[PDB]
Every structure is written in C-alpha cells, then in structure tokens.
Amino acid sequence: APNPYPNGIHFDRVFPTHYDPLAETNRTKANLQLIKYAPGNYSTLVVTSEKLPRPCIRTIQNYRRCQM
C-alpha cells in the first residue's frame, strides 16, 4: 500500500514527539506509548449530503407538481 499522504495531525501518549511527516520517507509505525496518527491513512476530503426521508420527498414532489 502506498505511503499515506503526509498529515501532521497526531496524538501523543507519553511525551510530545513533535511528529514531522516530511522528516522521513516511510511513515514509522505507531507505537502504543508514543503516538497515534490521524484517521484515514488513505482518505480524501469530499462533500456529502444526507438523503431526506422518502415521505418527506413525496410531499415535496406533490407540492411542486401541484404548483406547476
């Protein structure tokens, strides 16, 4: 799997490690007492939307149809 894209977000456990994702080529593995990395090793930023309930959609369609 490719090296995850550099992400400076991390969470310390014992001491501040000052993690720099650009200081090493391959990201070192996360030890339990040292660091926890940000979620989504392989993730991008998108925009999403919830789907309105089906009965709420049927009333919107009925209003538009009755309107036109």
Partner 1 sequence: YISSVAEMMFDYTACLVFYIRILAQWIRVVLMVVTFISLSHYVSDFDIT
- Interface positions with partner 1 (CB under 8 A): 14, 29-34
Choice between 33 and 48, CB closer to partner 1: 33
Helix, strand, coil abundance in the chain, percent, nearest 5: 20, 10, 70
Q: How far is the CB of 44 from partner 1 (least distance, A)?
A: 26
Helix, strand, or coil (residue 67): helix
Choice between 30 and 60, CB closer to partner 1: 30
User: Quick count: other Cβ atoms within 10 Å of Cβ 35?
Assistant: 18
Choice between 31 and 62, CB closer to partner 1: 31
